[PDB]
Amino acid sequence: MREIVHIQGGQCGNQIGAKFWEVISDEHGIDPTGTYHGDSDLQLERINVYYNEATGGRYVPRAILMDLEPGTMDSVRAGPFGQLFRPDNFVFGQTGAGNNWAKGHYTEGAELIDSVLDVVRKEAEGCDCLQGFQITHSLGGGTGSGMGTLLISKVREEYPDRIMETFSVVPSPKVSDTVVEPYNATLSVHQLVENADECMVIDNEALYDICFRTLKLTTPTYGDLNHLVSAAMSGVTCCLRFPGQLNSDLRKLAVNLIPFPRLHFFMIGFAPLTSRGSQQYRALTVPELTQQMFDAKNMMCAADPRHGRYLTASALFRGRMSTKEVDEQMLNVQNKNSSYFVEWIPNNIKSSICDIPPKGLKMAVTFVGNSTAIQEMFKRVAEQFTAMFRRKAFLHWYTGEGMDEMEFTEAESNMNDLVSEYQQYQDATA
Amino acid sequence: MREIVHIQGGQCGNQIGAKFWEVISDEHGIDPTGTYHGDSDLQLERINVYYNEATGGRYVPRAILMDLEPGTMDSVRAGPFGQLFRPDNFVFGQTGAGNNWAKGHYTEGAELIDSVLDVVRKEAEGCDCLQGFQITHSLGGGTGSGMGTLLISKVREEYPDRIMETFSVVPSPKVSDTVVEPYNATLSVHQLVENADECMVIDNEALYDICFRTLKLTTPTYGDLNHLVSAAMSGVTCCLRFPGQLNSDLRKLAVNLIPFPRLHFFMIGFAPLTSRGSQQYRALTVPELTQQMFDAKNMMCAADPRHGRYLTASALFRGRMSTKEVDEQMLNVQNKNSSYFVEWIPNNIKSSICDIPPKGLKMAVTFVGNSTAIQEMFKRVAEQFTAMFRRKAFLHWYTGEGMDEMEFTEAESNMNDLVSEYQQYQDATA
Amino acid sequence: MREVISIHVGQGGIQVGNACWELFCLEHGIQPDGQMPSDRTIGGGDDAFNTFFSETGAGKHVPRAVFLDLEPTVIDEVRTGTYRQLFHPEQLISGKEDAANNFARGHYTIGKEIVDLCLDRIRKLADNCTGLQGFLVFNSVGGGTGSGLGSLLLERLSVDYGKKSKLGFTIYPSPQVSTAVVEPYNSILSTHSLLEHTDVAVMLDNEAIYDICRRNLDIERPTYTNLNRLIAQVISSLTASLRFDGALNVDITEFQTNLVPYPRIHFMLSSYAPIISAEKAYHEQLSVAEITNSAFEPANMMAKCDPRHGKYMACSMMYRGDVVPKDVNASIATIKTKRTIQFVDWCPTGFKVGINYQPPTVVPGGDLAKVMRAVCMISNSTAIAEVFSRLDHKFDLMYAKRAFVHWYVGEGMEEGEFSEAREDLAALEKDYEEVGIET
Amino acid sequence: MREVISIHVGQGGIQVGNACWELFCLEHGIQPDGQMPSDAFNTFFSETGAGKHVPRAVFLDLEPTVIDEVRTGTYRQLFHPEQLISGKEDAANNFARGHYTIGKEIVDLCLDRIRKLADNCTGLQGFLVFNSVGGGTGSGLGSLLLERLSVDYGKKSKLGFTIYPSPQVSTAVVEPYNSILSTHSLLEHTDVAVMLDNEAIYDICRRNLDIERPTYTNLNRLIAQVISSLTASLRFDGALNVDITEFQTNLVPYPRIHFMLSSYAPIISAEKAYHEQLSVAEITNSAFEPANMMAKCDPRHGKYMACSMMYRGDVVPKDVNASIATIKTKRTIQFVDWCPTGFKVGINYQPPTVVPGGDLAKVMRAVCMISNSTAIAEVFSRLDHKFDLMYAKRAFVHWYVGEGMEEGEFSEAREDLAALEKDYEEVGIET
Amino acid sequence: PAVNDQAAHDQYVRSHGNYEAGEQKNRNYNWKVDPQQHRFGKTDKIASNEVV
Ligand SMILES: Nc1nc2c(ncn2[C@@H]2O[C@H](COP(=O)(O)OP(=O)(O)OP(=O)(O)O)[C@@H](O)[C@H]2O)c(=O)[nH]1
Ligand SMILES: Nc1nc2c(ncn2[C@@H]2O[C@H](COP(=O)(O)OP(=O)(O)OP(=O)(O)O)[C@@H](O)[C@H]2O)c(=O)[nH]1
Ligand SMILES: Nc1nc2c(ncn2[C@@H]2O[C@H](COP(=O)(O)OP(=O)(O)O)[C@@H](O)[C@H]2O)c(=O)[nH]1
Ligand SMILES: Nc1nc2c(ncn2[C@@H]2O[C@H](COP(=O)(O)OP(=O)(O)O)[C@@H](O)[C@H]2O)c(=O)[nH]1
Ligand SMILES: [Mg+2]
Ligand SMILES: [Mg+2]
């Protein structure tokens, strides 16, 4: 019961998803051929959440892969774990969005979604009791941000009471691969705040720093960055698939983290992370995990958490540990840093404990925090947008496919409205 | 409990620490791989004073290695006992100071000191009940004398109530290896007198004198001087680490040695020390130990202790010995040398006994003395400084990095003020 | 002949219930599978277990309890454990969607589809019983389904049975350490329902139990398993007079006639002594005089409340072991001579003492050391006004700007019940301050 | 049914209580484990019902070094594990640290434990407290403990076995500072005080036991023997029994003058203790010998007020009386005019016990003498001189000031010592 | 995993005093009685009916 479905779109989303399924299958003991090879009963206890059951006893993930070109979806099938997914769930076009949000949301993306909504509707209908959706996509691309945000709107219309997760990779100025990133990123934020219940933002800038310094490996690639995100993604739903002292599903996280409906943008991080040469000098204890958890350099976002005030924060502990240690550590950090925690809400940290740690680790921690420091990212993105739009540069592509400059101004006002509304509580006092 | 964290900076500081940690490891029975191999049960009871936690049945020191150039630490990491230290604690720049106090304290010191302060904060938060800090550095160099004292200032700012030790190797005019020594020396003394709680001055000339005359060894090197310094440093906290008839931690020494707040510069010495050829002819007894302890040539400074009067003195005895003998020998010395002990402080000698002798000896003593005879060390430094400062020689290097004549004039004024206020008590009587 | 029915709702109540049912089976010699050991099947002729269990007609015994929760993880975990064969299969009611710390979810949306099934189970259990004394309900207040379903059950049971006594062993949030962030909201809402529908309430916060384990049991890293073992001993001690012969027996109905002066005032906090480990248990005598003095020690209060800040009203303290009626009288009279412990003026005599012969039992492989004597205390004092006042302050800070409200309004909750719940806590405060005033 | 609680605070108190308790356990026949291999013990030990016993003592310190020795030595089994109170940071010879900074965070638990012990006790005679005056925590916590006990229990007798600094031999350097403050604290809070400075015991050891290199272990054995001889009347049958309360009946003429110094005899090494009969007349003169005083003080420099001597062994009452007449007839030993009868005697039938590995030789007769005399003013005068020389230019004052002590406390203690010396001088004159 | 066994866990417990979840403190006594058994208390000797 209370199972969830997975949808991934674009190149960035597909690469994130292709590694997330690798991580999950390892925990539950599923080989790439879909045959169980585990050792404990708890691995097969709650497999209904992420997997379907087919004749012959093979498990298949309930995931939908969407894109507008077969370039990336041909590689994912030709590589490892390509036989895990159902061949009929692969849906894709033939042209490609061409890094144009208007093309991926108005002209070409709207034409394709008739097919993909059918398989999603079929998947969400055959389940016993749906819990929610989760989306992986990038806000800096055409098909990822274009079709991805449109798919959220229509699914929301059919499932008003279900919850939605989005693991979004927003583009930072320091690492830029497209020249029209500020345009389509801003347009994606407009529709995202309206429909998505929970939004987690990821930065390629921050992931590089973590891999450069904490893991101390000189040559990262997109393979390693996708793995860092994958570990956190499985951590959020860890307590949904394993027993624990304190149980908290996705809905419980939403209630305890969102004070007001429009403020649902979070930052995430993982612990422990140690280099190969320094892994035998560390001792795995709760007091040392909480130090790396709250480290400002460990967050997966370019925003500095010490530049604002934490509205609320959550920690998901995995492994064997005592609740007295966990509870007393979350109290101390709040008292020592009362300046960085907003003061009209007492004890704004929620703790959950799961009894099964990840693969090969005695203990692990996933941190999800809602802080006012996230405003800086939108401010610097909007600054790039207003310089480009004041000259109407590259705007003949969007105006040439049915959308007008009225929408561009309207979207900018809402995004600027969010920051002003979000920063209000940073200086608000009781 | 009542544990201390160690910080070593500069070439001289790193060389001192590389020997001090070897001595401590040999005393506590720690192999070069960091695994306990002791024989007696007492050797493990108080190991948390100096060593941290690690998985695998091993222990790791709580020391931080800091320098602006990677030359010396890359050498010590490949040497003996070099695998104990955590690679995370190794912090280095890429430029170096080049014997410039301004460069190592204003331009490059501020840029790098953030990481060392962060790691020190990590260690201090981790440790159970901090007792204090101890530093090993040389005052005649650029990176050491500047960045170490900047660290002293910041650590005193953050922990105003903890204790602090510094072991300064000040430049001596008899053996000079640098033409710009007086400037940074007086600049560092000006900062250190305000912040340090316990400072213990060492001279290379005195060490060479000792190894040439008492040890009677033909060719001393930096190894033997470092060994003497390490033994003297370990003797201070021997009674803190091990049980004894009278236990006395660092705090008990300060309140018994410092009469007035700005008189906290001591000179130290060790006994017994004998040549290899005369080892089997000598008799190791308490009177001989205290005789060599009060021998003038045994001090580790160029200052003659017979040119001034002792304010207070403290001796830390090691081994099993009768308490009456120690007291009667102290009284006998203080009575037979009543001219060299200032009158208005009756019974100005302190004694402590620890029942665990050093590895190699049956009896050993560490002497610490606060004598009005330390001023000649400051007097000779100031004479060179004013001679070089009258003509403004070599001053453009310092004044081109944010410094000017004002702080030089201020420091020389503070330098003479300490000398005058420190000599006044030599002539002050009851 | 005499029965009591225990109701467990919410994760907090269920996990406490698991510890309690481990102790009851061991106290009566029943194996986890429900069958008595083969060596002494016919040995246990006396039916002292009839208070909690019921004979199946041929062989095993079934507990008189039902398990309730909307989330399936905790319940189905029991069904896969070694206790799968003890409980009746269809009295472990399970849902599909959790309340998710939302009181409106567990009282209007999901809670109304499960309360129907439970009352059917309770009806069948009650008809088997013939001398029913009362109900025992365990639920954590600071939770969604714990406060939601518990409110619905007590309201439903109050009209379905009427005069039957009900006891609530609730767990209120700690003064400073907490798990959730919005529990001050639904704690007040829970307080509204149990005020007029529960005869006796017990304060069992978590901070006090943490300190007891750290100080007396000498456990530096306690967990929830250790906490629930201590609570089980309190439940066993209170009901020990219903199933064991003693000098002074006490019934379940022999609480509200002696501990409730006024109908509104029925909240109380518990205390237990001695709590000691085997390493230092045999250094001291554990005499009657010193075990009863530790009961009044503020550090052994099971709730983080300071009795020195208020007056005592009534104390029901139960002795089990080899205590002598002469010994307790001398110990009690000594207390009255003490000046720090001050009772209210209009209560000249304020001690209800019970004596039992069965010494307390300890689970093998556990923490505690078995001792000849133990005393459990239930005290009604005016000092409990602090725990409600600090909850009132926490709620007023967040509700002043309508924080987290939209999660409740959208689940069938009207805006106005937040205000009216606040007033009743304020009304409760005035009752406590006006009852301890000097006349 | 008569009991007495002993409090050991500071390193000196702990290291003398170790010897006291090994001696008591050996004397009563209880193994270090606390078990008795198959009623007089009831004064010091409490039965747990099945097997072992527990001493009526509590250990205090802020430095965990000495306590960890007890919890790991051969006596780990004897003591209750939560009455070995241990701190984390030592006072480090700073009196204000042990009275104003960290003494207020540990004294509460000590009072709790003492209350628990006193509730168990039923015939509490009084308190024994052992401390080192010339130290930080010893003078600090001891002061706080006496201040709290004096209001908590009231009229219960408290006896302080303090150890003042020696005239010329001492270890610390700020030690004269905090001895005066502790003197103020204990003057109005201790009913009977005994002086047990170190230098006098060193002389006794060298002169009698013929050991040239004694240590603290040898010294603490003598103090334990003195304590056992003092308290043996509470737990053994004798011809004349003296309680604790018959010391606050016979030795303190005026409420202020309650300081005294002790003596013990015979103390002879075994190599020469058997060539002499050591009759009662010999031991009674060795006790009055000025060189045999346990405090570095000269009794010939003042009068005598009261003298209590405890005989244990096979003594005969008439033999004691003849010794009293001989002492009175001697001209060097003179008593004050307003005290015609000046001796209180006690006789006990239990011979002294011998600890294996010790230096003392077992003898049939032994006398412990407690004397109140005007000669004790000289130690106060010499510590006053040392303090005045120290305080002339305000040395080491900032260390105490930066811990919460007001400036005028030193002056108040100084005038207190002046008043005490004036009281001794005015009471020493004739009528 | 590179995890420490019991022979290192006990050493670290003795060294730094870090404990597992809900682990008692073992002071390593020497018992004549069995700690698992025995009721750990002093009982006053109770006689039979003396009033007769
Ligand atoms: N003493 C004790 N308290 C517990 C335990 N488990 C949970 N709690 C308390 O219960 C509160 C939250 O409610 P939970 O028990 O976790 O869950 P619930 O009451 O069933 O409500 P839901 O979360 O909606 O399912 C926490 O703040 C804890 O204080 C436990 O095992 N022992
Ligand atoms: N007779 C005797 N005296 C001792 C012994 N140990 C210490 N002292 C006395 O104690 C004095 C110093 O104070 P300490 O007891 O050592 O230290 P403290 O009182 O515990 O105060 P802190 O050092 O701050 O803990 C010395 O002058 C000694 O005379 C001992 O073993 N036997
Ligand atoms: N983490 C991660 N980021 C990626 C990967 N591939 C591309 N990106 C980022 O995504 C941005 C471009 O998005 P894109 O893939 O073109 O979106 P799409 O056109 O909708 O598929 C670039 O700035 C990259 O930094 C990947 O494999 N992993
Ligand atoms: N005792 C000792 N002194 C040293 C050693 N190495 C260098 N020195 C002294 O340190 C002085 C040079 O200081 P330096 O290392 O350049 O200071 P820095 O520039 O701040 O690192 C020389 O005068 C040496 O006498 C050593 O191994 N042992
Ligand atoms: Mg639950
Ligand atoms: Mg001490």
UniProtKB/TrEMBL annotation, chain E:
Instruction: Tell me the compartments it is located in.
Output: Cytoplasm, Cytoskeleton
Name the UniProt record assigns to this protein: EFHB C-terminal EF-hand domain-containing protein
- According to its UniProt entry, this protein's organism is Tetrahymena thermophila (strain SB210)
Q: Which residues of the full protein are shown?
A: 160 to 211 of 422
